[PDB]
Scaffold this active site. Structure first.
Site, PDB file in Angstrom:
ATOM      1  N   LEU A  67       0.859  -1.224   0.000  1.00  0.00           N
ATOM      2  CA  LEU A  67       0.000   0.000   0.000  1.00  0.00           C
ATOM      3  C   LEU A  67       0.863   1.230   0.000  1.00  0.00           C
ATOM      4  O   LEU A  67       1.842   1.260   0.779  1.00  0.00           O
ATOM      5  CB  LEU A  67      -1.008  -0.092   1.161  1.00  0.00           C
ATOM      6  CG  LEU A  67      -1.991  -1.029   0.360  1.00  0.00           C
ATOM      7  CD1 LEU A  67      -2.589  -2.213   1.052  1.00  0.00           C
ATOM      8  CD2 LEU A  67      -3.104  -0.312  -0.420  1.00  0.00           C
ATOM      9  N   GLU A 114     -11.501   0.879   5.535  1.00  0.00           N
ATOM     10  CA  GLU A 114     -11.485   0.864   4.027  1.00  0.00           C
ATOM     11  C   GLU A 114     -11.320  -0.607   3.533  1.00  0.00           C
ATOM     12  O   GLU A 114     -12.063  -1.080   2.621  1.00  0.00           O
ATOM     13  CB  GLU A 114     -10.420   1.776   3.540  1.00  0.00           C
ATOM     14  CG  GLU A 114     -10.614   2.323   2.061  1.00  0.00           C
ATOM     15  CD  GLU A 114     -10.529   1.270   0.993  1.00  0.00           C
ATOM     16  OE1 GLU A 114     -11.409   1.283   0.083  1.00  0.00           O
ATOM     17  OE2 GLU A 114      -9.633   0.424   1.023  1.00  0.00           O
TER      18      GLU A 114
END
Ligand SMILES: COc1cc(Cc2cnc(N)nc2N)cc(OC)c1OC
Ligand SMILES: COc1cc(Cc2cnc(N)nc2N)cc(OC)c1OC
Length: 186
Positions: free
Chosen positions: A22, A30
């Protein structure tokens, strides 16, 4: 087989990964949204199918591979069998969608969710037909080395709301984000 969809989280400079990780700190809620959308199936006795490229599969921590409660298909021309833990392998997105008609899947699959990477999104987004994009806008820049393709707003309409999708601004770890749904049919 039901609907065709892509799902992604994207920074303001269009980033979707940095060296297979990420670009942003992990956002728990999320990720809970990604699991809910990709797992929930409208049709009794079927599961949804997730389709991903090889580098996206191996980006997933081993504990979260395969995505539970979903059928997992990996795209690759180099591999000759599904990776450890995966269920199906196809050489291309076109071949995968063709498999979805065959007898071993035709009655097993509800929705189809494309979960990456960049070139897999680009091919799906530029093919004719009915397609939705579930896009989480992470509202700051983060250093990235892999990016989401351009969304052509000529053809993709941003929907004004969608059931099961919050419409207001969210925030975790000091980072504001919001959920959007786009639809084309060409
Ligand atoms: C490829 O598998 C996963 C990918 C992601 C990244 C991701 C995270 N958020 C959204 N909205 N879309 C995405 N594609 C998140 C996931 O779980 C939270 C995955 O399951 C392991
Ligand atoms: C699958 O859910 C993911 C979670 C994370 C961060 C992360 C979260 N928890 C653990 N135990 N290991 C991690 N690397 C990172 C990921 O990709 C790099 C994920 O896949 C998209």
């Amino acid at each position: 087989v039901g609907s065709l969809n892509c799902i992604v989280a994207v920074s303001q400079n269009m980033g979707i990964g940095k060296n297979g990780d990420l670009p942003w700190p992990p956002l728990r809620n999320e990720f809970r949204y990604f699991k809910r959308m990709t797992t929930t199936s409208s049709v009794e006795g079927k599961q949804n199918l997730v389709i991903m490229g090889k580098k996206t599969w191996f980006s997933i921590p081993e504990k979260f591979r395969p995505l539970k409660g979903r059928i997992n298909l990996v795209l690759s021309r180099e591999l000759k069998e599904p990776p450890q833990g995966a269920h199906f392998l196809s050489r291309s997105l076109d071949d995968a969608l063709k498999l979805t008609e065959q007898p071993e899947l035709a009655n097993k699959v509800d929705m189809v969710w494309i979960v990456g990477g960049s070139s897999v999104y680009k091919e799906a987004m530029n093919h004719p037909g009915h397609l939705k994009l579930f896009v989480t806008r992470i509202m700051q820049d983060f250093e990235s080395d892999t990016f989401f393709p351009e969304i052509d707003l000529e053809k993709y309409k941003l929907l004004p709301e969608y059931p099961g999708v919050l419409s207001d601004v969210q925030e975790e770890k000091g980072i504001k984000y919001k959920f959007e749904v786009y639809e084309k049919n060409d």
